[PDB]
Amino acid sequence: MLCEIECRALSTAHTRLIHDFEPRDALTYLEGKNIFTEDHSELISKMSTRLERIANFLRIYRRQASELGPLIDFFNYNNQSHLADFLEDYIDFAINEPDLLRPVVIAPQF
Amino acid sequence: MLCEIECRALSTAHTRLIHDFEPRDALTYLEGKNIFTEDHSELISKMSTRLERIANFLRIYRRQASELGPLIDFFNYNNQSHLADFLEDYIDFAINEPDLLRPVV
Amino acid sequence: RQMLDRKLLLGNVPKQMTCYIREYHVDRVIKKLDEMCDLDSFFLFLHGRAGSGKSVIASQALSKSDQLIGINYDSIVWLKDSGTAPKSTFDLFTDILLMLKSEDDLLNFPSVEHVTSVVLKRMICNALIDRPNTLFVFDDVVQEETIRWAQELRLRCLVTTRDVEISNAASQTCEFIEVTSLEIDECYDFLEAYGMPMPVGEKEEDVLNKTIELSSGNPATLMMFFKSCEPKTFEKMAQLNNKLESRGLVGVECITPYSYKSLAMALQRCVEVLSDEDRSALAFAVVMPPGVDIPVKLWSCVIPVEQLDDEVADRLKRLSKRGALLSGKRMPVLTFKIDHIIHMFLKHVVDAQTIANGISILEQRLLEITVIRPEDFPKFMQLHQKFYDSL
Amino acid sequence: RQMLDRKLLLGNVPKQMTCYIREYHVDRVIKKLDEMCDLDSFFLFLHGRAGSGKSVIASQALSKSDQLIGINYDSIVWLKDSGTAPKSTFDLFTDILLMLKSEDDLLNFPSVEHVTSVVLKRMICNALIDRPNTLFVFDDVVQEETIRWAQELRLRCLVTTRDVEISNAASQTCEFIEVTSLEIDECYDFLEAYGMPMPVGEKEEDVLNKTIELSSGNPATLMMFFKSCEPKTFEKMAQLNNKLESRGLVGVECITPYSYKSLAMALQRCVEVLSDEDRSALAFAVVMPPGVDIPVKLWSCVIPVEQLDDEVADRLKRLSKRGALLSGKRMPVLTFKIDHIIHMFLKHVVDAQTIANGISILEQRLLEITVIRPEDFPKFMQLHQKFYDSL
Ligand SMILES: Nc1ncnc2c1ncn2[C@@H]1O[C@H](COP(=O)(O)OP(=O)(O)OP(=O)(O)O)[C@@H](O)[C@H]1O
Ligand SMILES: Nc1ncnc2c1ncn2[C@@H]1O[C@H](COP(=O)(O)OP(=O)(O)OP(=O)(O)O)[C@@H](O)[C@H]1O
Ligand SMILES: [Mg+2]
Ligand SMILES: [Mg+2]
Known part of the structure; x- marks a missing residue:
């Protein structure tokens, strides 16, 4: 399982994960890095709308991974690096430099 | 582009690149050795905090250079040699030996 | 400022008062809440006399600054307690389980009444995962069992109550804010805000002061007095005062935002x-x-x-x-x-x-x-x- | 140290106490537990007087080290018994079946109450395969019937109880730890911990002594007597030692963490x-x-x-x-x-x-x-x- 910090990130960066993203694109990369199952990919892969595949990808994902690695190491490869960069920035304004998360990486989207 | 070794180094030596460093200091030396662009230096040069200029210097950098040379050959000249020495040490404990960590603990 | 309202409505947060706001308290209920972003499972006790206006100010803070919702906490859950029975402390959490649940599977909502507590509690902290930085508002706690369960649920709580003898059950650091009787200077503002005759006749002045003294800062009663001065005539306020020293609150009782x-x-x-x-x-x-x-x-x-x-x-x-x-x-x-x-x-x-x-x-x-x-x-x-x- | 908390919360383990830790015991409840990794289906009896503090120590003994959960045992199940009825020893296990169950299929939870004790038992040891080397904390056993079923379920048990006359029910590796009355030297530490004038003056030292004697070293009633030392003035402790020799525990009763x-x-x-x-x-x-x-x-x-x-x-x-x-x-x-x-x-x-x-x-x-x-x-x-x- 993840936690509040790692799940608060998937939620904060949600206005964005809706405008450009697709869970079908990540299913192959995750059945692989060992974080899914052949029913998992079935469940998220056959979904009429994308907000469905997205809400199932973010639900299923928060349970399966020991951390938020194999999803930054994916928006990179998928030419959606403007995404994996935002999330890695957010994970950094928490461990090393505390406090700075709310003024810097949280407010500019109110 | 770099790779996992050269990018794992910029990450491992990160607790340090925050305490003493500045991307403005390196922009001139890199627009030069041909690894930046006049929008690149604009983007990293106008940033309110340094952790911004640092995170953009390390993001932008990992894409542009064919290798991790023109950044050791800089912490040297900038009196920040205690940095370029740590990174050259790290590139060596991998360049001269074929053994590391495996998937373990 | 349009996303808040979505979040406020869904967290069942009542609309904050507009025609008169207390900057000192609302501004003190927001401050203390911001300080607890780093802290987890904390109690904030907005405790006061019945009718002081505790519940109004909590919502006030929640809706004012947009930082509390979005910046400091991701979502809001505001639930009114008022539990007296022994089944009440369990029933509150059944209403806090469906709150936390998805719009989907309110259809599948099972026979939740017939479930063991150790299950409602585990069942809640099992779905509470999908809820990063959650602030729960517990408007009107009377029993300490809600405080008890909550601490077992490691929750983040704003709490409106009258008795501050149950906040102490919790064996964790607790912050308190007391809703005092409305100060003399303030009252004036409250009246003018809703509307009242301005100090004109020295006696009239003095009489208004006496009236603000009587209702020792109880906006609920203050409202009761106000709503019931329709003539908005001073001559009718002096008729109304009397009625009080002969009929208690009873005569003054009128329909008000108050339940x-x-x-x-x-x-x-x-x-x-x-x-x-x-x-x-x-x-x-x-x-x-x-x-x-x-x-x-x-x-x-x-x-x-x-x-x-x-x-x-x-x-x-x-x-x-x-x-x-x-x-x-x-x-x-x-x-x-x-x-x-x-x-x-x-x-x-x-x-x-x-x-x-x-x-x-x-x-x-x-x-x-x-x-x-x-x-x-x-x-x-x-x-x-x-x-x-x-x- | 963040995985524990996940495991503690899900095993319904209570928040470990922090402001005062009984070193010698918590450190004796952990030791004996580590010694039991091979010996399967064992009973550990943390038995003592009432309010003597047994349950708190289990909270701490499973909350200090990172070994007990993860290293020595994979998971935790902590269930409060307190069963008096004859249906209680069966009801506990229904609450221990869903505990052990997956987050999935709590929806499918059937009419579990209407089933034979030969099914709930078989049904438990049928799903108990998933989690091996699992210990179950049974806070507050009164009936030996619990100890009976458990031994039939070959379980690994920590047990908090007051009557140590039920272990007789188990023909097995029974090991014991008694929660004694708080020693004189210790008490002092307990007080200082919660913030309180320490023994200094003569008549007062002699006055502070009397206190312990009355509680006769008892944490629960040592807490209740402090949550009633609101002023924290020695002059007010003496006002009360009196209240005790005229009102028993009754007068000292002060709502606190103890149920x-x-x-x-x-x-x-x-x-x-x-x-x-x-x-x-x-x-x-x-x-x-x-x-x-x-x-x-x-x-x-x-x-x-x-x-x-x-x-x-x-x-x-x-x-x-x-x-x-x-x-x-x-x-x-x-x-x-x-x-x-x-x-x-x-x-x-x-x-x-x-x-x-x-x-x-x-x-x-x-x-x-x-x-x-x-x-x-x-x-x-x-x-x-x-x-x-x-x-
Ligand atoms: N800031 C305010 N503006 C206008 N009316 C107020 C205000 N504060 C209190 N009131 C009056 O009190 C009523 C509700 O009082 P409120 O619920 O705020 O007090 P309370 O402390 O919650 O009482 P309780 O604890 O019994 O809920 C309103 O209908 C209004 O008449
Ligand atoms: N180490 C401690 N620190 C603080 N308070 C304690 C401690 N030990 C016992 N207490 C007091 O006792 C209360 C709970 O006692 P505890 O549950 O530990 O005793 P117990 O032996 O379980 O009693 P029972 O067998 O009736 O459950 C707490 O609310 C507290 O007041
Ligand atoms: Mg109210
Ligand atoms: Mg107990």
Whole structure:
């Protein structure tokens, strides 16, 4: 399982994960890095709308991974690096430099 | 582009690149050795905090250079040699030996 | 500023007051909440007298700055408690399970009533994952079981309550904010805000001051007085005042935003919960100076039970720490005091015989015996003979 | 150290206490648990007086080290028993079936109550495959029926209980840790921990001492007496030590973390379970020099019921092994002793008559025909008359 910090990130960066993203694109990369199952990919892969595949990808994902690695190491490869960069920035304004998360990486989207 | 070794180094030596460093200091030396662009230096040069200029210097950098040379050959000249020495040490404990960590603990 | 409203509505947060806002409190309920972004499973106690306005200010803060929702906390869950039964502390969480649940599978909502607690609790903290930085507002806690369960649920809680004797159950650091009676200067603002005649006749001035004194900062009652001055005529406020010294809150009772027509209806509930022996202490507290700093011994005279009079003080402190029923002061000398609003309720509700009985005993103690010094002058009950003649 | 908390929360483990840790015990409840990794289906009995603090120690012993959960045992299941009905020993396991179950299929949870005890048992040991080397904390066992089923379920159990007369139910590796009354030196630490004037002045040191004696080293009632030292003034501690020798635990009752407002409310339950004839023994314990090593024969005088007498001792041993109400020693001579806390419960918990009645019987056999030797001086229980003087 993840936690509040790692799940608060998937939620904060949600206005964005809706405008450009697709869970079908990540299913192959995750059945692989060992974080899914052949029913998992079935469940998220056959979904009429994308907000469905997205809400199932973010639900299923928060349970399966020991951390938020194999999803930054994916928006990179998928030419959606403007995404994996935002999330890695957010994970950094928490461990090393505390406090700075709310003024810097949280407010500019109110 | 770099790779996992050269990018794992910029990450491992990160607790340090925050305490003493500045991307403005390196922009001139890199627009030069041909690894930046006049929008690149604009983007990293106008940033309110340094952790911004640092995170953009390390993001932008990992894409542009064919290798991790023109950044050791800089912490040297900038009196920040205690940095370029740590990174050259790290590139060596991998360049001269074929053994590391495996998937373990 | 349009995303908040989505989040406020879905967290069942009541709309904050607009025509009059308290910057000092609302601004003090927001501050303390921001300070707790790093902290987890914390209690904030917005405690006060019945009708003070605690519940209004919580929502006020929640909706004012947009930082609390979005920046400091991701979502809001605001649930009214008011639980008295023993099943109530369990029922609240069933309503807090579906709240937390998805719009999907409210259809699948099972026979939740027939479920073990150890399951509702585990079932909640099992779905609470999908809820990063959650702030739960528990408007109107009476029982400590809700405080108990909550601490077992490692929740982040704003809490509106009257009794601050249950916040202490929790064995974790707790922050408190007391909703005091509306200060004199403030009141004025409250009136002008809703609307009232401006100070014009020196007497009219003085009379308005007396009125603000009576209702010891109880916006609920203040509203009751206001709503019921429709003529908005001073000449009709003076007709209304009188009605009070002859009908208690009862006559003033009118339809208001308050769930309650009459404040006496509210305070009832504050007199039921009271320790059986503490109830009578209050019952005998009726025959006392109103809004006057008076000694413990002078009180020892009417209150039930060797140089062990201290038991009087213990009752007066406990009673004061249950919806602010009393206002004990430490210096110069240990003294308490009643408030008019707190006075018209008990007076018009308690037994007159007890009132008389009490008034008869006091004289016995007397014969035995703002800078009042009832140390050589307690013998005399003639100082408040004005109040004393009324019965 | 973040994975534990996940595992603790899901196993319904309570927040470990922080402001004061009983080192020697928590460190003795962890040790013994580590020693048991191979031996499967074992019982650990953390048994003590009521409010003596057993349950808190299990919270801490599973919350200090990172070894017990992850290293020594994979998962935790902590369930509070408190079962009295005959359906209770079955109901506990229904709550231990869903605990063990997956987050999925709590929806599918069937009509579990309507099933045979041969199915709930088989149904549990059928799903118990998933989690191996799993320990189950059974906070507050009263019925030996629990200990029975568990042994049939080959479980690994920590057990918090007051009566240590149920382990007899298990034919097995039973190991024990007794939560004693808080030692004198320790207490001090407990007080200082919660913030309190320490023993400094003479009369006050002598005044601070009296306190412990009364609580007779008891954390629960040592807490209740502090949540009632609101002023925190020694002058107010003395005001109360008094309140105690006139109101028993009743007056000191102060709402706190303990599910119980009064210790007498707790001990009740320890006096209901008691053998009918053993119950009668408790009543006479009251009339006795509280906190004194006193002979068996001197007890034979008040206790109900032969050329040879040994029935008094049998009652005193059984009674001592069931809530730790009485403390008996072997050497120099077979003697037992009551504890103040165990004494005030009765002083306010027995028929006002049966106290006085019993005193007359003791005086009758009194005439007859720390090194107390009531062998030539029993005729005069005056050494204890200091207490006997009291009605
Ligand atoms: N800031 C305010 N503006 C306008 N009216 C107020 C305000 N504060 C309190 N009131 C009056 O009190 C009523 C509701 O009081 P509120 O719920 O705020 O008090 P409370 O402390 O919650 O009482 P309780 O604890 O019984 O819920 C409103 O209908 C209004 O009449
Ligand atoms: N280490 C401690 N720190 C603080 N308070 C304690 C401690 N141990 C016991 N207490 C007091 O006792 C109360 C709970 O006692 P605890 O549950 O630990 O005893 P117990 O032996 O479980 O009693 P029971 O067997 O009746 O459950 C707490 O609310 C606290 O007041
Ligand atoms: Mg309200
Ligand atoms: Mg307990």
